[PDB]
């Protein structure tokens, strides 16, 4: 099948404004949220119907308890970072863990932390070591690496446990995650440019590029972002500037889910 990924995010805020939670955790399969928890609800809840229908309440009870403890552990860790940064005010602390099951069967695994939206600690499960960006992270690195069993534990979870959860969730929502909606591609004009527009496609992974007379134009092409339409499908575009003094053979190329598409502009 296609490449799929599972990942969990954590967010902590030291001095949040009134109403906003100081801890949030959301899980994703590909681009779909599957789980959620925050310091206000103090409950872990599904974010997808095919998650709520296939996981018994004892599952949500158990992980609610874990996240109440992890919420406190995250509060402790952020207090330690902000004290050693000598930073005052409200600051953020983020964590991302997950894995990918690639098309050819190979797997990847990642775990990293961020402070104020910047890389902080990056785990290398092949050298069993942590990468530190500054001397506050270097202090955390020496403490985490002194517990060799903790590094080994994460390596096993990324390579074995994460992949097994991903396969389990892939089956629960295969009607959503493994479907293909091919895109609707058109061209039009708009000082004159050509816009290649696609919409109504899933999965959101798509490649759009312009070609002039058969050669690629990577430096001159303007790429729009892949945006959610709100109905489970996505849209994107790619423009290019037309030469007013010479005619050329411009053709839009679209790649999506193993199908290549060409639109020649006449």
């Amino acid at each position, epitope marked *: 099948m296609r490449t799929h990924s599972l990942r969990y995010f954590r967010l902590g805020v030291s001095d949040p404004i009134h109403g906003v939670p100081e801890f949030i955790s959301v899980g994703y399969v590909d681009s779909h949220p599957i789980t959620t928890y925050d310091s206000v609800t103090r409950q872990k809840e599904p974010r997808a119907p095919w998650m709520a229908e296939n996981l018994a309440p004892d599952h949500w009870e158990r992980y609610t308890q*874990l996240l*109440r403890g992890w919420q406190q*552990m995250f509060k402790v860790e952020l207090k330690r970072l902000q004290r050693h940064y000598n930073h005052s005010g409200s600051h953020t602390y983020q964590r991302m863990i997950g894995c990918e099951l690639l098309e050819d069967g190979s797997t990847t695994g990642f775990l990293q932390y961020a402070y104020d939206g910047q890389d902080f600690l990056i785990f290398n499960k092949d050298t069993l070591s942590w990468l530190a960006v500054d001397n506050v992270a270097h202090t955390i690195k020496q403490a985490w690496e002194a517990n060799q069993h903790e590094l080994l534990y994460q390596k096993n979870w990324l390579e*074995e446990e994460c992949i097994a959860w991903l396969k389990r969730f892939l089956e629960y929502g295969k009607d959503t995650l493994q479907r293909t909606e091919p895109p609707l591609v058109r061209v039009n004009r708009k000082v004159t440019a050509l816009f290649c527009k696609a919409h109504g496609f899933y999965p959101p992974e798509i490649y759009m590029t312009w070609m002039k007379n058969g050669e690629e134009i990577v430096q001159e092409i303007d790429y729009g972002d892949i945006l959610p339409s709100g109905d489970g499908t996505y849209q994107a575009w790619a423009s290019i500037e037309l030469d007013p003094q010479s005619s050329n053979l411009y053709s839009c190329h679209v790649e999506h889910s193993g199908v290549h598409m060409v639109l020649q502009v006449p």
Partner: antibody
Amino acid sequence: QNIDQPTEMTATEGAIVQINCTYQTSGFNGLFWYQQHAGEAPTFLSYNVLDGLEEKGRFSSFLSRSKGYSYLLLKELQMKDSASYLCAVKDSNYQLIWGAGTKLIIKP
Amino acid sequence: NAGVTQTPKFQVLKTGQSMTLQCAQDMNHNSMYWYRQDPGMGLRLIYYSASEGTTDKGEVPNGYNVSRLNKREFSLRLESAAPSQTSVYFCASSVWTGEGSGELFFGEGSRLTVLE
């Protein structure tokens, strides 16, 4: 969920003894060995989560994730090693499953 | 420096009597547990406290209840004692729960015998 270890084992002072532990779990997050003398509290011995053998003094512990199998190797046995040795596996939800324990008897 | 302290070390009880077992730890741990040990079985969790301010049922919660008094103390409560509850009760603590390879630190143990 299932974990098994022999009820009781007898070896001679100065010999070597290997205490086995097999587990059938959904997911695996580590295997612990604990030592419990008669009438007292269990204390932590070793931890394995990746395959191989970890040596620590007279004791060493092995893990095979594929076979769902671990053993605790006690070398140069002494009378003070007479105790129960408990096996515990952490499952996919980080819940500990405990084996019944293995009472080790040392003949002097 | 005292580790895990639980009291009482021994107790006889008549069927239907109330009882409360105490457990404290001066190690600044967050997770605390109550186990019962029986001949021929592995340890069975009764109740656990992932951190201060939350508790949840274990494998055998019926006939028991708990109270995470604070960060240090986690007491096991028998409402109406029953002969099946005759057992050795162990309280344990760990730095965190579900966080990797953290081992358990056990208390000395509490031997309960319930008689008609």
